[PDB]
DNA sequence: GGTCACCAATCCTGTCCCTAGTGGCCCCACTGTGGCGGT
DNA sequence: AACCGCCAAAC
């Protein structure tokens, strides 16, 4: 915790290794409130090379650097290149630019630099990477996070003794104090957009805005220090010369950790009530059996603000979703059994072992038909007796509600089946809407790194941008004005592609620009096969103008996706891959024939206040994934040289959470659930542009 | 002029080319690579000599020692008659108008240049060159003409073209009538796909090679400059199948590089066909055939669009005279795509 | 001349992979499979009993009577199988005429001229004879060579069929029969054409048929395991996975290639031994380099004097009584072998 | 013209060993893939 | 002044 708690080690190698690890940004901050002199010696000895220093507590070569005003001058030259956002990540060709801004607006559902106090990284020139370490290294003062320039800016009197303890003058010290306070990092926004800075078009007031995404030092440093502590699933990105990228990258030897949560789709084997008991909201025993209740009865009686009956209904609203979740859990394995029994008409995983498993594919659960089994329900009522032995073993049987839960399970039976539901929707309009189903789309070498924090699926903003490019081309081709408002995304196949990408020869910039190969940037790439369902709005004149031209609809389908090449299914597949639908029942009748191993990419409504809550929430549920949600704007939109559009803005990629739901779960949850809680839209606001539900 | 941050999407979109074979049971068995550990001789210049060409102070038996090499190998299984290499190709019309521009003056100029180049039938010549690269099997790279190769092309239009033997074809040789008919028809379809934005055009292209007994396959090799001590120093580009098996494959850019090996306008009597590049980069020699200091590079030719417009507007009427090869190179680079400042 | 930053050659000879199998009345391909056998080995080494100063170690009297547990792969012919078959394919390309990569166009044009002058002297004929002679005597069987009466059957893509009735009668230096020399003459002409004509596509299907002794041991390629666990086998074999799911015991392509290119006996005027073509002429048995870096017989010393060798080749066709310099024969055997012959930018 | 009968039963008693040991030698590649301030 | 030099290390 404290500085000299780590100085107790007699072995200098272990001591200096622990000290160099302690003052690096990929670890926790140590307290130097008691130890200011010794702290200054090590912080000023860190300014040297590793092979130049034997021991960091040698006082004389610290005074050699401190007395030499060719050494401290370089350290105060490097303060002007202190960033809150690294423009040189991952491409180091972004020439002599510094972005220092306040954190953006705080959002409940996404994670950014708004969720932490304003900390600084450094990125200018690899030659001066050590010279930054004096004035950019973060420590713990009194009870406050601070760095040397900030603590010497105002509270100098506390450090006068520590600085004069070596034999520094008062004249030089106060001149150093005022020049450091004058040379503090200002609000630095670049005057022009760099050639190697990535720009995208986001929909602004009545047009488009040029957005450059820049990583935040704080969120990266938190993910790095979370990855060294071995708290979540991480994969590696290696850099050639890390000192040219940043100091954080230089400290880690260029090996940067990213959140690795890809979708897992297996073609192979099925191997009980198992899927429920495993989902563990659910069952077997506990978290949270048993209610035994009293708990449920007490909750209803408290909610009896506004009349015992009206309260029970208000309890139900949350407690029915909770009671529905209990049935959904219980149904997870009933789903799997059924599933098998279709594919098969033969088998489960093991036909006999299934028949043996108390809650598996029984020839009695075989049917009657789905439809007639739900209409029968009977099975659901019987399973309540089986739930005297599993789905809560013994305790909490007649107890506050078991009858109500049995009734909900009997109602769910009707919902669990077939040839039912059907109609009546404010969404989109209706005058009518359309549903464009794109099926069996193959993509080769799409960027798996959604943002430079997260690895797994491609970005949802990439799916949005592709759909928006498709809309623009169609509306310009046909002369219509239809809108591609929302989409749902089902992944059939996913595979990670090994190896880096070799860049071609070009005029690489210097004092004299020469024809040569650029630096090899490491990335993550995936081959994936997916289906998209796009929800089209507009006038029936425009919709039936769209429906009349199927070849022109097929023609303007883009061939680019997240940097990868996007193809329609193979010509011998016999798959009509570009289908329009007027009604929802016909679409859902088509959609429940999907492969069962595939995953729906589903929006969630979980709130996250910092990284540790997100990591606990990821360690909670095995089917959640941290992904790119969109852009939190840092600067104000204005005219900037090198911009694609009229107005340019620097933004930060926001980390949200998606769910990889099974095809069966979405099939059993009903048509209403699918059409309300599976569709993505871009909430484009003044200061943020984020992907969300509805 | 400079054109103020001009941007073009590429027109040709090939996918991954997957190697496989067929049994009497299955119509797709993926060709898999096995890791083998072999001896290598110490046969390099630096093993024995200083940079001044003087013998190093080594032991008398240092050059008789071996390097332990961990390499990936792909062979045809014994008594498998045919190797199959299949890829898909999409063609879009992205060469007509710049996708990103600032000045509407150069936008109007380039759009006018594009449609007047279209009317003279330059896209036909470029389509013929791309089609000829597809028919002779340039995209097999080192597997080309190792056996009697038969190339089948199925199109989204509903056509079905077949080249019987690619060993009987070359770039400069005179073909049979049926092979010229295949070239003509498929060139027309590719040219139609390049010139019209309101048509969809895809193609499934399959090469069937008569395999020799346990013949070596030459797929794409991965880029790795941070290989570990345990791993193979030479690995191959793979594609995962329906099951948990990896077919050895070519990169999309590798196929793309083969199809666009059309540029032989860089000299008056150029025998070699370069991959279309802004500076005509030759991978074998390691020089630029259209160097940055010359007038033959793209950024020199691209400033004379107003003169090439006048030349084309004379060429459209005067009926016979050939188009300036600079304009062929110009539009080949526009079909390749990129950002031009 | 000066050696370039980039100076590559693709190899001309492409042996596929040699697979061991046998034939029944039912099947014309039954693959020869290996099995892991656990045998008892003694402590017979120098270091087991002696110090480096040749003094006895301090060990128990029963220590040298203890054994090592060996996990080895064994391949024997099944009982009452008459013949064993080793089969590989060979493709020959013309890759020694032009370097695959070259930085200096003066070096490139010189090496192109040298190959064309060597071609018109009939230099590729002599090299093709030595590659062909290694196929007919069965050098590529390595330790299976002349273990029984071996018949070698060669089918070329031209439509020619060649047959050696017994390889035990043939050797490298021995006087051949009239029919065996006719096979050597005709097949050497087909390889020479393939080595020199880029338009010619040539491949051969080469099969050995060995009269097997009862449960005879087969000697295929062994994989290079430097570190081994106690469970897995210390001696493992190179295997070709068949289309069904069976592993035929096999030779490496590079192993077959090493046998065909065992043609180098120019390193001394009265040299009895034929080395595998190496830049420094590495003798693996004696453990010396027969073309040392200090000598002028090594490849890089000969390759920089290629202007002086091109002068001698142009005076060769004018006489055609004086033979070609053995330094030039060795030179073109390395270019057929292929490799990366690159110095650096100083 | 069409199906493949019901009613119950799966045995108890005791144990898986001892000795000794998993080798020496030699080796693990050359090419390219940099921004920035200064003398 | 155009061209050799400086600069990092996580599990």
């Amino acid at each position: 915790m404290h500085l000299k708690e780590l100085l107790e080690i007699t072995d200098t190698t272990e001591r200096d290794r622990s000290l160099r690890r302690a003052f690096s940004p990929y670890t926790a901050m140590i307290d130097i409130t008691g130890s200011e002199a010794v702290a200054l010696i090590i912080l000023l000895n860190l300014t040297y090379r590793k092979n130049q220093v034997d021991d960091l507590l040698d006082k004389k070569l610290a005074k050699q650097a401190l007395k030499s005003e060719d050494h401290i001058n370089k350290c105060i030259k490097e303060i002007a290149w202190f960033h809150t956002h690294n423009l040189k990540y991952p491409d180091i060709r972004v020439s002599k630019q510094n972005l220092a801004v306040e954190p953006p607006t705080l959002h409940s559902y996404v994670l950014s630099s708004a969720n932490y106090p304003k900390a600084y990284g450094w990125s200018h020139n690899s030659a001066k990477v050590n010279f930054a370490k004096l004035f950019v290294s973060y420590f713990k003062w009194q009870n406050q996070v601070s760095w040397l320039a900030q603590v010497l800016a105002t509270n100098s009197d506390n450090w006068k003794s520590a600085f004069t303890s070596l034999g520094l003058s008062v004249k030089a010290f106060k001149s150093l104090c005022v020049t450091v306070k004058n040379s503090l990092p200002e609000e630095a926004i670049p005057d022009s957009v760099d050639r190697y800075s990535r720009q995208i078009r986001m929909p602004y007031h009545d047009g488009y805005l040029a957005v450059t995404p820049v990583i935040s030092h704080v969120v990266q440093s938190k993910i790095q220090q979370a990855a060294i502590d071995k708290r979540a699933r991480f994969s590696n990105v290696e850099f050639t010369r890390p000192a040219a990228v940043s100091m954080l990258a230089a400290s880690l030897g260029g090996v940067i950790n990213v959140l690795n949560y890809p979708p897992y789709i297996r073609s192979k084997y099925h191997g009980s009530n198992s899927r429920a008991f495993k989902l563990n909201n659910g069952q077997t025993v506990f978290n949270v059996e048993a209610l035994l209740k009293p708990e449920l009865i007490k909750a209803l009686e408290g909610i009896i603000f506004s009349n015992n009956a009206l309260a029970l209904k208000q309890r139900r609203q949350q407690k029915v979703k909770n009671i529905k979740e209990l049935r959904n859990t219980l149904l997870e394995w009933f789903s799997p059994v059924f599933e098998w029994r279709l594919d098969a008409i033969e088998n489960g995983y093991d036909l006999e072992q299934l028949e043996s498993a108390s809650e598996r594919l029984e020839y009695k659960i075989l049917s009657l038909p789905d439809n007639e089994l739900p209409s029968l329900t009977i099975p659901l009522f019987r399973l309540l007796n089986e739930m005297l032995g599993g789905v809560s073993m013994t305790q909490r049987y007649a107890f506050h509600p078991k009858l109500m839960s049995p009734l909900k399970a009997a109602l769910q039976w009707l919902l669990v089946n077939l040839t039912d539901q059907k109609h009546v929707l404010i969404e989109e309009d209706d005058e009518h809407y359309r549903y464009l189903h794109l099926s069996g789309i193959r993509v080769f070498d799409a960027q798996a790194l959604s943002n430079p924090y997260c690895s797994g699926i491609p970005s949802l903003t990439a799916v949005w941008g592709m759909i928006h490019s498709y809309q623009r081309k169609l509306n310009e081709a046909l002369g219509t004005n239809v809108r591609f408002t929302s989409f749902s995304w089902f992944i059939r196949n996913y595979s990670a592609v090994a190896g880096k990408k070799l860049p071609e020869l070009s005029l690489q910039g210097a004092q004299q620009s020469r024809l040569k190969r650029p630096g090899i940037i490491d990335g993550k790439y995936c081959d994936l096969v997916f289906d998209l369902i796009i929800h089209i709005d507009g006038y029936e004149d425009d919709l039936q103008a769209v429906d009349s031209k199927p070849d022109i609809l097929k023609a303007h389908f883009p061939s680019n996706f997240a940097g990868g090449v996007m193809h329609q299914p193979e010509l011998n597949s016999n798959i009509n891959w570009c289908c329009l639908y007027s009604n929802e029942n016909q679409l859902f009748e088509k959609l429940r024939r999907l492969p069962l191993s595939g995953c729906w990419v589903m929006p969630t409504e979980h709130k996250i206040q910092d990284l540790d809550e997100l990591l606990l929430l990821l360690n909670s549920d095995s089917k959640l994934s941290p992904s790119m949600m969109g852009y939190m704007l840092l600067t104000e939109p204005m005219a900037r040289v090198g911009s694609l559009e009229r107005l340019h803005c620097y933004a930060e990629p926001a980390i949200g959470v998606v769910k990889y739901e099974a095809a069966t779960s979405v099939r059993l949850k009903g048509i209403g659930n699918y059409f309300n809680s599976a569709f993505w839209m871009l909430d484009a606001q003044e200061k943020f542009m984020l992907m969300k539900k509805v | 002029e400079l054109c103020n941050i001009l941007k073009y999407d590429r027109s040709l979109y090939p996918g991954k080319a997957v190697f496989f074979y067929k049994t009497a049971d299955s119509d797709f068995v993926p060709l898999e690579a096995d890791i083998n550990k072999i001896r290598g001789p110490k046969s390099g210049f630096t093993e024995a000599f200083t940079p001044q060409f003087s013998p190093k102070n080594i032991s008398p038996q240092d050059l008789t020692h071996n390097n332990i090499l961990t390499l990936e190998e792909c062979y045809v299984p014994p008594n498998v008659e045919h190797i199959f290499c299949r890829f898909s190709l999409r063609v879009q019309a992205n060469s007509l108008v710049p996708s990103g521009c600032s000045d509407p003056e150069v936008f109007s100029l380039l759009k006018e240049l594009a449609e007047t180049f279209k009317e003279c039938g330059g896209y036909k010549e470029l389509a013929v060159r791309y089609c000829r690269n597809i028919l002779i099997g340039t995209w097999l790279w080192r597997n080309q003409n190792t056996g009697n190769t038969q190339i089948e092309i199925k199109t989204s239009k509903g056509s079905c073209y077949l080249i019987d033997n690619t060993r009987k074809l070359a770039w400069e040789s005179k073909w049979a009538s049926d092979d010229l008919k295949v070239l003509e028809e498929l060139s027309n379809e590719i040219e139609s796909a390049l010139t019209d934005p309101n048509v969809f055009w895809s193609a499934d292209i399959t090469a069937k090679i008569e395999a020799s007994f346990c013949q070596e396959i030459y797929p794409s090799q991965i880029l790795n400059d941070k290989v570990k001590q345990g791993e193979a120093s030479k690995q191959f580009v793979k594609a995962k199948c329906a099951d948990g098996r990896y077919a050895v494959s070519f990169n999309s850019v590798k196929i793309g590089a083969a199809l666009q090996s059309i540029d032989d306008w860089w000299d008056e009597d150029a025998s070699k066909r370069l991959r279309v590049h802004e500076f005509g980069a030759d991978k074998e020699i390691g020089v630029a055939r259209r160097p940055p200091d010359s007038e033959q590079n793209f950024y020199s030719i691209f400033k004379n669009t107003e003169w090439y417009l006048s030349a084309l507007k004379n060429c459209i009427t005067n009926k016979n005279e050939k188009i300036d090869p600079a304009i062929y190179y110009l539009f080949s680079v526009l079909i390749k795509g990129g950002m031009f400042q």
Side-chain angles (χ1 to χ4, degrees), chain A residues 510 515-531:
Chain A
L515 181 69
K516 64 177 290 178
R517 209 172 286 282
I520 300 166
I521 304 174
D522 188 65
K524 304 304 216 68
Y525 305 100
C526 56
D527 290 1
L528 74 157
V529 183
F530 65 88
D531 287 28

Side-chain angles (χ1 to χ4, degrees), chain A residues 93-141 143-147:
Chain A
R93 289 178 295 174
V94 178
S95 188
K96 289 166 282 189
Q97 294 203 330
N98 192 63
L99 184 59
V101 297
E102 285 81 3
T105 64
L106 200 148
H107 200 273
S108 301
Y109 300 95
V110 314
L111 174 68
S112 69
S113 65
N115 293 244
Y116 294 95
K118 183 178 182 186
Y120 284 81
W122 171 92
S123 176
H124 172 223
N125 179 35
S126 49
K128 317 299 178 179
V129 67
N130 303 317
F131 290 92
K133 294 189 184 182
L134 181 50
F135 278 121
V136 82
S137 289
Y138 273 76
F139 41 73
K140 187 64 65 64
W141 202 63
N143 282 320
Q144 203 165 223
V145 53
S146 201
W147 73 101

Side-chain angles (χ1 to χ4, degrees), chain A residues 21 26 49 126-127 130 250 252-253:
Chain A
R21 279 179 61 70
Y26 65 85
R49 269 192 273 107
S126 49
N130 303 317
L252 280 158

Side-chain angles (χ1 to χ4, degrees), chain B residues 133 136 138 171-172 261-264 271-275:
Chain B
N133 269 320
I136 70 180
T138 310
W171 189 273
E172 68 272 24
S261 297
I262 67 158
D263 176 33
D264 65 351
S271 58
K272 197 170 193 168
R273 280 160 281 116
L274 305 176
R275 191 256 184 277

Side-chain angles (χ1 to χ4, degrees), chain A residues 436-510 515-596:
Chain A
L436 178 59
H437 183 218
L438 300 156
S439 191
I441 297 174
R442 306 175 290 154
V443 166
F444 311 102
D445 296 23
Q447 291 164 18
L449 284 174
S450 309
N451 47 13
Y453 309 130
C454 312
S455 185
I457 54 156
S459 179
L460 285 155
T461 51
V463 186
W464 183 87
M466 187 256 285
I467 289 165
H468 199 67
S469 188
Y470 190 16
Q471 180 195 312
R472 284 181 92 270
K473 284 166 182 169
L474 193 69
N475 284 334
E476 204 276 320
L478 292 185
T480 62
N481 198 359
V482 308
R483 293 174 313 284
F484 287 18
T485 52
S486 55
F487 63 94
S488 56
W489 186 20
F490 176 75
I491 296 172
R492 297 163 159 267
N493 287 118
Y494 184 90
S495 74
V497 178
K500 314 180 201 292
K501 292 191 169 181
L502 184 76
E504 67 178 337
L505 304 180
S506 55
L507 285 183
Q508 290 308 286
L515 181 69
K516 64 177 290 178
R517 209 172 286 282
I520 300 166
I521 304 174
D522 188 65
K524 304 304 216 68
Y525 305 100
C526 56
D527 290 1
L528 74 157
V529 183
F530 65 88
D531 287 28
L532 277 170
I533 299 88
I534 312 170
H535 173 239
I536 313 169
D537 305 13
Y539 301 126
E540 264 283 297
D541 297 327
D542 295 323
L543 290 179
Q544 297 210 61
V546 162
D547 213 324
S548 293
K549 298 292 206 307
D551 289 22
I552 308 189
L553 189 77
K554 275 186 167 74
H556 290 273
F557 174 63
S559 52
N560 194 292
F561 180 61
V565 49
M566 177 157 64
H567 281 194
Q568 91 299 343
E570 300 198 42
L571 297 177
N572 56 357
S573 303
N574 302 316
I575 305 300
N576 187 225
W577 62 270
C578 194
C579 307
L580 268 166
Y581 298 95
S582 297
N583 71 98
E584 309 193 26
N585 289 300
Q586 188 178 1
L587 178 58
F588 202 77
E589 183 60 29
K590 186 62 65 182
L591 275 175
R592 98 280 198 281
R593 202 183 62 193
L594 280 167
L596 277 75

Side-chain angles (χ1 to χ4, degrees), chain B residues 46-323:
Chain B
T46 53
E47 292 295 333
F49 293 110
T50 67
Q52 297 86 49
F53 193 73
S54 76
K56 288 185 167 181
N57 189 41
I58 60 168
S59 307
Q61 63 185 343
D62 273 343
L63 295 176
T64 65
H65 295 328
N66 294 289
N67 304 317
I68 301 168
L69 316 176
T70 314
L71 308 173
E72 279 185 7
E73 291 157 9
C74 187
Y75 296 100
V76 182
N79 312 293
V80 172
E81 193 173 6
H82 304 283
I83 314 149
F84 291 88
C85 195
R86 181 156 61 207
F87 76 101
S88 295
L89 176 72
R90 281 189 64 186
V91 182
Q92 290 194 149
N94 296 322
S95 183
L96 300 180
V97 293
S99 55
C101 194
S102 297
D103 192 6
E105 291 291 323
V106 302
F107 189 82
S108 183
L109 178 68
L110 283 165
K111 189 173 180 181
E112 191 192 344
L113 179 76
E115 66 193 7
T116 199
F117 183 73
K118 172 179 139 72
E119 282 172 2
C120 303
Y123 280 111
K124 176 60 191 190
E125 180 56 36
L126 293 181
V128 156
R129 295 208 165 213
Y130 297 143
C131 183
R132 196 183 285 116
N133 269 320
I134 296 169
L135 292 188
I136 70 180
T138 310
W139 54 276
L140 299 172
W141 281 99
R142 214 185 172 180
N143 311 285
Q144 182 184 42
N145 305 328
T146 55
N148 294 322
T149 311
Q150 161 187 312
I151 296 189
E152 178 194 286
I153 299 141
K154 289 174 165 176
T155 323
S156 61
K157 188 180 288 290
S159 302
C160 178
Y161 309 101
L162 193 75
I163 302 292
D164 184 46
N165 198 7
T166 67
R167 278 180 164 178
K168 304 303 169 203
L169 306 184
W171 189 273
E172 68 272 24
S173 72
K174 191 173 186 293
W175 295 13
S177 300
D178 58 339
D179 292 325
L180 278 168
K181 188 193 164 188
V182 166
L183 174 57
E184 173 55 32
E185 284 174 310
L186 185 52
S187 301
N188 289 320
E189 293 211 39
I190 289 164
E191 184 261 323
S192 179
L194 279 173
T195 50
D196 194 23
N198 289 297
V199 300
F200 186 83
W201 199 86
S202 180
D204 290 3
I205 303 170
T206 315
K208 171 175 166 163
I209 320 174
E210 290 191 12
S212 298
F213 187 71
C214 300
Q215 190 198 333
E216 193 177 14
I217 311 300
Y218 305 100
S220 275
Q221 295 174 41
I222 76 164
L223 167 62
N224 205 347
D225 59 339
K226 300 181 182 295
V227 68
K228 301 292 292 178
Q229 201 273 337
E231 310 310 321
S233 60
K234 172 173 167 181
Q235 304 186 66
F236 294 138
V237 174
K238 280 146 188 161
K240 195 161 86 76
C241 307
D243 58 340
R245 284 190 298 180
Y246 289 89
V248 94
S249 72
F250 279 127
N251 285 316
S252 62
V253 287
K254 188 67 164 166
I255 301 296
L259 295 196
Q260 301 183 55
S261 297
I262 67 158
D263 176 33
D264 65 351
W265 308 295
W266 56 272
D267 219 314
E268 289 83 14
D269 55 343
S271 58
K272 197 170 193 168
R273 280 160 281 116
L274 305 176
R275 191 256 184 277
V276 167
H277 194 250
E278 285 88 329
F279 299 106
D282 197 1
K283 195 186 182 200
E284 288 77 6
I285 308 302
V287 301
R289 300 296 205 178
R290 303 164 173 276
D293 67 351
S294 75
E295 300 293 314
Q296 295 291 314
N297 65 81
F298 180 71
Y299 295 101
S300 298
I301 293 173
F302 187 77
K303 291 169 181 167
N304 311 329
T305 49
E306 292 185 354
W307 183 49
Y308 295 142
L309 181 51
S310 298
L312 282 170
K313 273 189 302 209
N314 290 129
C315 185
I316 197 166
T317 64
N318 285 316
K319 176 63 167 59
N320 78 114
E321 77 269 39
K322 296 290 98 176
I323 306 165

